[PDB]
């Protein structure tokens, strides 16, 4: 290969593949693998490459296998040429080679060789070397994905493999179970005892997989522990997993945490949060997932994170999404015994360079204000002070939160509204603009000397306003009309005329609705006589609930709650049985 | 006609830089960087006829390019030039480099760039195409080589 | 490489 | 010949030149329409874009629908979100040019538009929604059709609500609801329609979508209230009122100020309705008057 | 589990393409690119991204993105730890996971990936076994390979794979029998504006290099194990004996090896070795301000503080700075507004400082806070926790190996408010 036509170079590679020199073959294959790694279409070399599948140079053999994996699915006819080589390799005394052959054979995605692969799997289960058996487990999974109809036989094979005492095999076998027949719990019952006893002796990746499986069946064999005595088998499960908590593998730790969260007695499970905290000492990618799990847990068991509160403090180096998650955790952990500290910290957080974070912080303060009524006066005061901040986002956000606070506590805060009326001149963000107008309307009887001035200002700007704002203008006007048509009906009419021609039909719909409702007319009946009751109806306070409340049905630790979506392949957890199923099945 | 000819790798490092229209040294460097982002980010299946950059004096001009392996060849030309004709000229320029370097490679761009420039000078003079006959351009290149070897 | 370590 | 070649550089240029011809003698250019459609199968999007431009120029009443079927075929198999957004936009622009100049069968058009709502992930769902409203409003003749299709879209909201992004899939619901409310007289099962609108899932929709729903829902209620009060089914009307009683309390807790605002004033209206109906008052007349004020 | 893997450089380019279950279109990477574009920083790119048909799990590390493609439900940390481990493996074989290392060893890394991941499931995972399955790319070996035709791929499953001690090789001998221990502690601390300690804890980890012949059974014990808590353990450790004896008994793996990690309880006040005096003046809408920072020793335990670096992320109002350092080196990046001061080490005869004026954007308002301080430092021959090892014993072998251990404390997550 050199600075020339790729076609010609490929022909030269064919010459190398045909050449009797092993080094020529190696060179070609390395170049070919490089092309595979680069996503290049080396498929045209397939009939030339396959000829070297029988080469004695093990280095080449590996390179060939790569090639075949990459293109055999496409060149299904040509791929058939490699079959005998694998078949012979499977009979070789060297089990490393046998295993390699088994793997490669199974990876060939050609429907023609299914019968062959099936036979190979059966023989593989009978291999007697645990190394090959481990590979056999993977072969099962592979065949299943290629031919679902063989499932019954594959199940029989798994059933056999489940009896293997070797810890180097069982891990993969369990994985295969989940991949092929996750519902066949009847195949495991007898094996539970050793699965528990040997779990600590299983390689870390297997342990993760096994534990997830274990929790899923545990919820059918046992009944919620939270007088109830603990089943020796239940106890076995938990007492054996205990030591795993200190594992170096974060996934393992999480798996352990999962187990206790969904199985362990609520009075005992508290311990796992200690470990969950040390997970935050690892790589950020891990931390992201961990924080989601913590937050999910904290919405129910606040006491499990309580003593570690300061560990959730946000550092300026944290990514916005990390800052956000920590903030939510702190939110859930806020209470009257620590809110004074948190508020000081939050006050600092509000001034962060990360305005997105600061905005969220402001929202959080509002949320904790509704949680702790005892501090809302001071919460409000600080929040109000933020209105003087030169930043548009900061102020606009605080306006919205204040609105919410006023919904919660509709006390005499006309002075805030008065201030808001002045702020409105500078407010750019439509949401806040609308919010201000809404507050004015809600308490226009408390600021009746201001409202009509605001009204005509808005009336002039109406066509340039956001549709949301326009809707507030309409509602504001309606209230002003009903309570003071003698001064505002002209402007009201103008506004109605503006709505009348506005292209956003939602506005027009609201406009005709209001017009008919508040403007005296031919059919001004009883309901129109209640317009003042309708517009002056007292509204209920908002519920600022945490989003994790919607993840209760997802199993903690799974992809599905990290997405908040029932992800492909996700199995839902069973509910606790009224009574436990016949224990002797597990004997 | 030709405003500049640039050769650079997939990391923006230069292999050849020859300008015909006057630019400041910083402008030249910036043009290269601009060009790099404009060319190296294009897929292998993207039309070789690109719009011009702005640092060169305007997008009316064109960036005709060709690349392989990790090397990019860009011909900055003005709006009146034949993008197709240029591409043809680019390839035969390369053919000349092969004729003179017995298959030109990156190492010739790296360590023999002075001769690459000599060759290039025979191909293009002042941004105007000096030679289109590939055997004649080699002939004159070797005539100079012989002169050098002689004395 | 042994330099710098505390004998133990 | 240049277009038929493999060199994308000159292929593009050929198409560019073809455009120059199209601009003055499209009557001859139309002969290569199929070729231009075939050009969309290349990898270089500037060619594919040029082809779309040429297709725009070549579309007429004698080949619109046919070209559209192929345009759809392409966007269906096409990959790339922004590419698809462009394809969508172009399909729309092509068929909408000069007030849908080449569409005589709007029934067809809308069903196409419905297929376009299935383009999951598009950032121009609001564009589609605008088109939905434009035709349903303008083409009176097929409003019944549009209503039935939009009611289907409203039932499909449980899937459409999988993406509540601004200008995304959920914007379809904006339009669908508006039409079904305004043209509720073309509903066959307005009760069902309401039940679909009353689904708890609605609370996860974008604020302005929910706002649309509660406004159309009370219009839909006005229609069914009139239906039952006209029929004389007072107890049926009591059940209807009870549904309002049992649904508005959910919406009033919406985070969207205007949803909870409208919901609150609606519930207050409902309170009065329940009292007046308890007093044997035919309130549907007064209620329907709140919507009857505008047809366009 | 995993269907495919793409190695993507922060530039937005794809360098290494792998497929195990089927061929995944490169267009799936557009969803990542979109997310990358939406994020204001590579650190803030969501590790989990859902697409219409695929789930994208990814890790950002060393300017590389490890983007895996999964079509079914797989526990996120399972995947994350796995991918992370792969990157660690690359560091083991090529010094570090870098795009350069990858493009220069494509065939080798391609092969490594094929051994490590089997049809989406973990296969070769333990370092020492993998090291025997595929020999590291030693230039001396490559010479031998060109001479003899020797492979880098073995033909015998390493005996340790089927042993009861899977984390290590069998039959390995050294003439230079030795073992090195490295006790590293990191100080995690939050200091407020007043200089008060907001939060602090100690993160420790003990690594080791094992060059001991045969299968020695090590026994590590501490003089003050009571200070250890929430200790992680590598699986090779006989946890039961840790619990009943409070002794770390185990037969270690060869070479580079992480043994345990631990936390020092907050019940003990964490000594802070460095204090900071500071003042930054920002007059609203001024063309300039003032900067003054002094770094000094505090609870340094009589040891030298060295390798000191101060990093500050300034607000957009800052255009440049007129600062003069007392030592080390002052530099400032006006592009990203980053202030970096190489402090060096502290000599008590004169404490280091950086001071001068700040060039601000005229007409732009002063910031509501001063940027927090990120400060690095190291103290050798010092375990700030006071952790001390009691004994290191060995059983099963007869030689008397070099035994050595170091104690060192470095800055952990050390940040100061201002």
UniProtKB/Swiss-Prot annotation, chain A:
The chain residues annotated with the modification Phosphoserine are 546
Q: Where in the cell is it found?
A: Cytoplasmic vesicle, Clathrin-coated vesicle membrane; Golgi apparatus
- Tissues of expression: Ubiquitously expressed.
Q: How does the entry describe its membrane topology?
A: Peripheral membrane protein
Q: Which UniProt keywords apply?
A: Albinism, Cytoplasmic vesicle, Disease variant, Golgi apparatus, Hermansky-Pudlak syndrome, Membrane, Phosphoprotein, Protein transport, Transport
Q: Which GO terms describe its cellular component?
A: AP-3 adaptor complex; axon cytoplasm; clathrin adaptor complex; clathrin-coated vesicle membrane; early endosome; Golgi apparatus; lysosomal membrane; membrane
Question: Post-translational modification, briefly?
Answer: Phosphorylated on serine residues. Pyrophosphorylation by 5-diphosphoinositol pentakisphosphate (5-IP7) impairs interaction with KIF3A. Serine pyrophosphorylation is achieved by Mg(2+)-dependent, but enzyme independent transfer of a beta-phosphate from a inositol pyrophosphate to a pre-phosphorylated serine residue.
Gene Ontology biological-process annotations: anterograde axonal transport; anterograde synaptic vesicle transport; antigen processing and presentation, exogenous lipid antigen via MHC class Ib; blood coagulation; cell morphogenesis; clathrin-coated vesicle cargo loading, AP-3-mediated; establishment of protein localization to mitochondrial membrane involved in mitochondrial fission; granulocyte differentiation
GO MF, one term, reads:
GTP-dependent protein binding
**Domain of life, per lineage:** Eukaryota
By sequence similarity, the record places it as follows:
Belongs to the adaptor complexes large subunit family.
The protein's name:
AP-3 complex subunit beta-1
Name the gene for this chain. Answer: AP3B1
Curated annotation (Swiss-Prot), chain B:
Localization, per the record, is:
Golgi apparatus; Cytoplasmic vesicle membrane
Q: Which UniProt keywords apply?
A: Cytoplasmic vesicle, Golgi apparatus, Membrane, Phosphoprotein, Protein transport, Transport
* UniProt keyword annotation of Transport present: yes
- How is this protein named in the record? AP-3 complex subunit sigma-1
Q: A single GO CC term, please?
A: intracellular membrane-bounded organelle
Expression sites by tissue: Present in all adult tissues examined.
Report the membrane topology from the UniProt record: Peripheral membrane protein
The protein's assembly and partners: Adaptor protein complex 3 (AP-3) is a heterotetramer composed of two large adaptins (delta-type subunit AP3D1 and beta-type subunit AP3B1 or AP3B2), a medium adaptin (mu-type subunit AP3M1 or AP3M2) and a small adaptin (sigma-type subunit APS1 or AP3S2). Interacts with AGAP1. AP-3 associates with the BLOC-1 complex.
Main subcellular localization, coarse class?
Answer: Golgi
Entry superkingdom: Eukaryota
GO BP annotation list: anterograde axonal transport; anterograde synaptic vesicle transport; clathrin-coated vesicle cargo loading, AP-3-mediated; Golgi to vacuole transport; insulin receptor signaling pathway; intracellular protein transport; intracellular transport; melanosome assembly
Q: Which family does it belong to?
A: Belongs to the adaptor complexes small subunit family.
Curated annotation (Swiss-Prot), chain D:
Which terms in the GO cellular component ontology are assigned? AP-3 adaptor complex; axon cytoplasm; early endosome; endosome membrane; glutamatergic synapse; Golgi apparatus; Golgi membrane; lysosomal membrane
Q: Which GO terms describe its biological process?
A: anterograde axonal transport; anterograde synaptic vesicle transport; antigen processing and presentation, exogenous lipid antigen via MHC class Ib; clathrin-coated vesicle cargo loading, AP-3-mediated; endosome to melanosome transport; Golgi to vacuole transport; intracellular protein transport; intracellular transport
Q: Where in the cell is it found?
A: Cytoplasm; Golgi apparatus membrane
Q: Does the keyword Coiled coil apply?
A: yes
Q: What does this protein do?
A: Part of the AP-3 complex, an adaptor-related complex which is not clathrin-associated. The complex is associated with the Golgi region as well as more peripheral structures. It facilitates the budding of vesicles from the Golgi membrane and may be directly involved in trafficking to lysosomes. Involved in process of CD8+ T-cell and NK cell degranulation. In concert with the BLOC-1 complex, AP-3 is required to target cargos into vesicles assembled at cell bodies for delivery into neurites and nerve terminals.
Q: What is the name listed in the Swiss-Prot or TrEMBL entry for this protein?
A: AP-3 complex subunit delta-1
Please report the organism this UniProt entry assigns to the protein: Homo sapiens (Human)
Gene name, please?
A: AP3D1
What stretch of the complete protein does the chain hold?
310 to 605 of 1153
From Swiss-Prot, chain E:
Q: Which domain of life is it from?
A: Eukaryota
A Pfam family: Clat_adaptor_s
> What organism does this protein naturally occur in?
Homo sapiens (Human)
In the bilayer, the protein is annotated as: Peripheral membrane protein
Q: Which PROSITE patterns match?
A: CLAT_ADAPTOR_M_1 (PS00990), CLAT_ADAPTOR_M_2 (PS00991), MHD (PS51072)
Name of protein = AP-3 complex subunit mu-1
Q: Which CDD domains match?
A: AP-3_Mu3A_Cterm, AP3_Mu_N
The record's annotation in SUPFAM superfamilies points to: Second domain of Mu2 adaptin subunit (ap50) of ap2 adaptor, SNARE-like
Concerning its family, UniProt says:
Belongs to the adaptor complexes medium subunit family.
């Amino acid at each position: 290969g050199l600075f020339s036509s790729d076609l010609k170079k490929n022909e030269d590679l064919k010459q190398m593949l045909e050449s009797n020199k092993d080094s020529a073959k190696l060179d070609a294959m390395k170049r070919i693998v490089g092309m595979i790694a680069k996503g290049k279409n080396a498929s045209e070399l397939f009939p030339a490459v396959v000829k070297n599948v029988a080469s004695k140079n093990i280095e080449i053999k590996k390179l060939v296998y790569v090639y075949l994996v990459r293109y055999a699915e496409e060149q299904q006819d040509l791929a058939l040429l490699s079959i005998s080589t694998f078949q012979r390799a499977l009979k070789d005394p060297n089990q490393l080679i046998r295993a390699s052959a088994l793997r490669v054979l199974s990876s060939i995605r050609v429907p023609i060789i299914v019968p062959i692969m099936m036979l190979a799997i059966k023989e593989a289960s009978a291999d007697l070397s645990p190394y090959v058996r481990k590979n056999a487990a993977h072969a099962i999974q592979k065949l299943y994905s290629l031919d679902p109809e063989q499932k019954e036989m594959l199940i029989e094979v798994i059933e056999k493999l489940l009896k293997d005492k070797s810890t180097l095999v069982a891990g993969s076998v369990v994985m295969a179970f989940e991949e092929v027949c996750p519902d066949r719990i009847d195949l495991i019952h007898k094996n539970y005892r050793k699965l528990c006893n040997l779990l600590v002796d299983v390689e870390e990746w297997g342990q993760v997989v096994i534990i997830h499986m274990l929790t899923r069946y545990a919820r059918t064999q046992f009944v919620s522990p939270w007088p109830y005595t603990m089943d020796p088998d239940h106890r076995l499960l938990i007492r054996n997993t205990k030591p795993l908590l200190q594992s170096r593998n974060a996934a393992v730790v999480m798996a352990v945490a999962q187990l206790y969260w969904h199985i362990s007695p609520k009075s005992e499970a508290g311990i796992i949060s200690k470990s969950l905290v040390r997970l935050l000492r690892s790589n950020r990618e891990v931390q992201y997932i961990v924080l989601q799990n913590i937050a999910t847990m904290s919405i129910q068991r606040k006491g499990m994170f309580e003593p570690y509160l300061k560990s959730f403090y946000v550092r300026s180096t944290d990514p916005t999404m990390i800052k956000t998650l920590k903030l939510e955790i702190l939110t859930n952990l806020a209470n009257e015994a620590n809110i004074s500290t948190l508020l000081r910290e939050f006050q600092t957080y509000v001034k962060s360079q990360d305005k997105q974070f600061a905005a969220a912080t402001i929202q959080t303060i509002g949320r904790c204000a509704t949680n702790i009524l005892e501090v809302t006066d001071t919460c409000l005061n600080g929040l109000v002070c933020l209105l003087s901040n030169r930043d548009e986002i900061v102020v606009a956000e605080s306006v919205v939160v204040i609105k919410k606070l006023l919904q919660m506590q509709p006390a005499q805060h006309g002075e805030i509204i008065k201030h808001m009326a002045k702020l409105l001149d500078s407010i750019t963000v439509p949401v806040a603009r609308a919010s201000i107008l809404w507050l004015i309307g809600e308490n226009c009887e408390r600021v009746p000397k201001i409202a009509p001035d605001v009204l005509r200002k808005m009336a002039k700007s109406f066509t340039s306003e956001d549709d949301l704002v326009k809707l507030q203008i309409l509602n504001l006007g309606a209230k002003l009309y009903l309570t003071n048509s003698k001064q505002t009906k002209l402007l009201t009419q103008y506004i109605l005329n503006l709505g009348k021609y506005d292209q956003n039909y939602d506005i027009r719909d609201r406009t005709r609705f209001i017009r008919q409702l508040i403007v005296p007319n031919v059919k001004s009946g009883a309901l129109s006589k209640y317009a003042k009751k309708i517009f002056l109806a007292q509204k209920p306070a908002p519920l600022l609930e945490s989003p994790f409340k919607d993840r209760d049905h997802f199993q903690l630790g799974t992809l599905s709650h990290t997405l908040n979506i029932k992800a492909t392949g996700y199995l839902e957890l069973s509910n606790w049985p009224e009574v436990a199923p016949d224990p002797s099945v597990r004997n | 006609m030709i405003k500049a000819i640039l050769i650079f790798n997939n990391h923006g490092k230069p292999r050849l830089s020859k300008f015909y229209q006057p630019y400041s040294e910083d402008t030249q460097q910036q043009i290269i960087r601009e060009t790099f982002h404009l060319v190296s980010k294009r897929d292998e299946n993207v039309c070789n006829f690109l719009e011009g950059g702005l640092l060169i004096g305007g997008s009316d001009n064109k960036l005709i390019y060709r690349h392989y392996a990790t090397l990019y060849f860009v011909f900055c030309v003005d709006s009146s030039e034949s993008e197709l004709g240029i591409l043809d000229l680019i390839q035969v320029f390369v053919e000349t480099l092969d004729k003179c370097f017995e298959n030109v490679c990156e190492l010739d761009l790296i360590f023999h760039v002075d001769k690459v420039h000599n060759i290039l000078a025979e191909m293009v003079m002042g941004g105007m195409v000096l030679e289109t006959n590939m055997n004649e351009i080699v002939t004159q290149i070797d005539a100079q080589n012989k002169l050098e070897k002689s004395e | 490489s042994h330099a710098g370590y505390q004998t133990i | 010949i240049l277009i038929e070649d493999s060199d994308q550089n000159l292929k593009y240029l050929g198409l560019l030149a073809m455009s120059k011809i199209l601009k003055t003698h499209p009557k001859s250019v139309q002969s290569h329409k199929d070729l231009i459609l075939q050009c969309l199968d290349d990898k270089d999007e500037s060619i594919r874009l040029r082809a779309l431009d040429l297709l725009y120029g070549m579309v007429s009443k004698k080949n619109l629908m046919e070209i559209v079927k192929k345009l759809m075929t392409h966007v269906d198999k096409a990959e790339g979100t922004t590419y698809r957004d462009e394809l969508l936009t172009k399909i729309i622009d092509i068929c909408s040019q000069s007030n849908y100049q080449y569409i005589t069968n709007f029934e067809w058009y809308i069903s196409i538009l419905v297929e376009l709502t299935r383009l999951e992930g598009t950032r121009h769902g609001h564009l589609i929604a605008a088109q939905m409203l434009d035709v349903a409003i303008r083409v009176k003749a097929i409003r019944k059709f549009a209503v039935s299709q939009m009611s289907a879209l409203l039932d499909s909201a449980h899937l459409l609500a999988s993406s509540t992004q601004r200008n995304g899939i959920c914007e379809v619901l904006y339009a669908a609801a508006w039409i079904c409310g305004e043209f509720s007289e073309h509903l066959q099962e307005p009760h069902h329609t309401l039940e679909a609108m009353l689904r708890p899932r609605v609370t996860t929709l974008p604020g302005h979508i929910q706002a649309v729903y509660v406004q159309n829902v009370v219009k839909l209620y006005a229609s069914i209230l009139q239906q039952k009060e006209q029929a004389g089914e007072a107890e049926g009307a009591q059940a209807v009122t009870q549904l309002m009683v049992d649904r508005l309390p959910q919406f009033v807790q919406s985070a969207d100020l205007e949803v909870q605002e409208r919901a609150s004033c609606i519930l207050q209206l409902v309170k009065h309705i329940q009292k007046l109906q308890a007093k044997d008052v035919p309130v549907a007349e007064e209620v329907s008057a709140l919507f009857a004020g505008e047809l366009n | 589990m995993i269907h495919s893997l793409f190695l993507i450089n922060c530039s937005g380019d794809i360098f290494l393409e792998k497929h195990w279950k089927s061929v995944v279109s490169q267009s799936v990477c557009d969803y990542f690119f979109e997310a990358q574009e939406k994020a204001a920083d590579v650190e803030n790119v969501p590790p989990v991204i859902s697409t219409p048909h695929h789930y994208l799990i990814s890790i950002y590390r060393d300017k590389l993105f490890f983007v895996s493609v999964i079509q079914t439900e797989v526990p996120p940390l399972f995947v994350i730890e796995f991918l992370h481990r792969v990157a660690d493996t690359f560091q083991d074989y090529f010094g570090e996971c870098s795009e350069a290392a990858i493009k220069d060893n494509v065939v080798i890394v391609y092969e490594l990936l094929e051994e490590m991941l089997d049809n989406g499931f973990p296969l070769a995972t333990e370092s020492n076994i993998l090291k025997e399955l595929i020999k590291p790319p030693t230039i001396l070996r490559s010479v031998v390979n060109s001479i003899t035709g020797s492979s880098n791929v073995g033909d015998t499953l390493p005996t340790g794979q089927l042993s009861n001690i899977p984390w290590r090789r069998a039959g390995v001998k050294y003439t230079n029998n030795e073992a090195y221990f490295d006790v590293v502690e990191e100080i995690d601390a939050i200091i407020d504006k007043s200089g008060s300690t907001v939060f602090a804890e100690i993160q420790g980890v003990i690594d080791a290099c094992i060059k001991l012949s045969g299968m020695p059974d090590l026994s590590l014990s501490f003089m003050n194990p009571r200070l250890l808590d929430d200790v992680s353990f590598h699986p090779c450790i006989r946890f039961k004996r840790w619990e009943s004896e409070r002794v770390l008994s185990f037969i270690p793996p060869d070479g580079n090896f992480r043994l345990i990690s631990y936390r020092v309880s907050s019940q003990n006040l964490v000594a802070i070795p460095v204090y900071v005096k500071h003042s930054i003046s920002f007059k609203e809408n001024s063309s300039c301000g003032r900067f003054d920072i002094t770094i000094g020793p505090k609870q340094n335990m009589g040891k030298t503080i060295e390798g000191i670096t101060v990093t500050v992320h300034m607000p957009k109002v800052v255009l440049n700075m007129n600062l003069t350092p007392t030592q080390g080196s002052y530099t400032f990046d006006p592009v990203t507004k980053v202030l970096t001061w190489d402090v060096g080490k502290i000599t008590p005869q004169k404490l280091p400082s950086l001071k001068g004026l700040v060039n601000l954007q005229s007409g732009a308002p002063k910031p509501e806070e001063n940027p927090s301080l990120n400060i690095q430092f190291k103290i050798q021959q010092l375990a700030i926790s006071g952790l001390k090892v009691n004994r290191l014993d060995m059983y099963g072998e007869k030689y008397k190996p070099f035994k050595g251990v170091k104690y060192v404390t470095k800055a952990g997550k050390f940040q100061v408010r201002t």
